[PDB]
Structures are given as structure tokens and as C-alpha cells.
Amino acid sequence: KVNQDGSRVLLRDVAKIELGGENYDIIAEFNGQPASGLGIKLATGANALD
């Protein structure tokens, strides 16, 4: 908004804006060291070792 004054209101003011993390539920520690992993789950009747 703009008020009846001239003073401008923009997101920056009303809210803190940081980039990253769409959800904060799961975090991983590789030997205590912060890390992310790729956990692949198998299909049904696939080809394993291949």
C-alpha cells in the first residue's frame, strides 16, 4: 500500500525474506557433519544390481 501520506510499504518492511528451505522437518548428519543424501527406493520387479 501507499497510505494517504506518500510513505511506501513493501514486503521487506512487513516480512523477513530469506531464500531457501520449503520445509524444515528433516535434517541429516553424516557422522555429525551436516549433509544431504539421495535415498533411492526400488521399483516393483525391477533389475537390482543393474
Binding site: 528451505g21 520445509n23 524444515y24 522437518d25
Partner: protein, 50 residues
């Protein structure tokens, strides 16, 4: 006006949680919040204000 007031009263809404995903370091309790819930009987539907 009958329809519009029906879905306004007979509603199931998903609200947030006490002590959510990004927390304050030292948060003790984590609980889900229930706001409105779906009306279950003929009496509760009779009490829908217009």
C-alpha cells in the same frame, strides 16, 4: 444465500502448529491446532446462522 452460508459454516480448515517447522532454539512442546471442523448432525446444520 443458503448455499454461501452453508460452506461458510460447514467447513474443514487446515491451520498451523504450536512450535512449527522452523522453531525457536529452546522450544519444548509441539502440538497441532484445530480451528473449524465438519458438522456431523442434523441439529448442527439447523444452527447454521444466515
Amino acid at each position: 444465500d443458503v448455499i454461501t452460508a452453508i460452506k461458510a459454516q460447514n467447513a474443514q480448515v487446515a491451520a498451523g502448529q504450536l512450535g512449527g517447522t522452523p522453531p525457536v532454539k529452546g522450544q519444548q512442546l509441539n502440538a497441532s491446532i484445530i480451528a473449524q471442523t465438519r458438522l456431523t448432525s442434523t441439529e448442527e446444520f439447523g444452527k447454521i446462522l444466515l
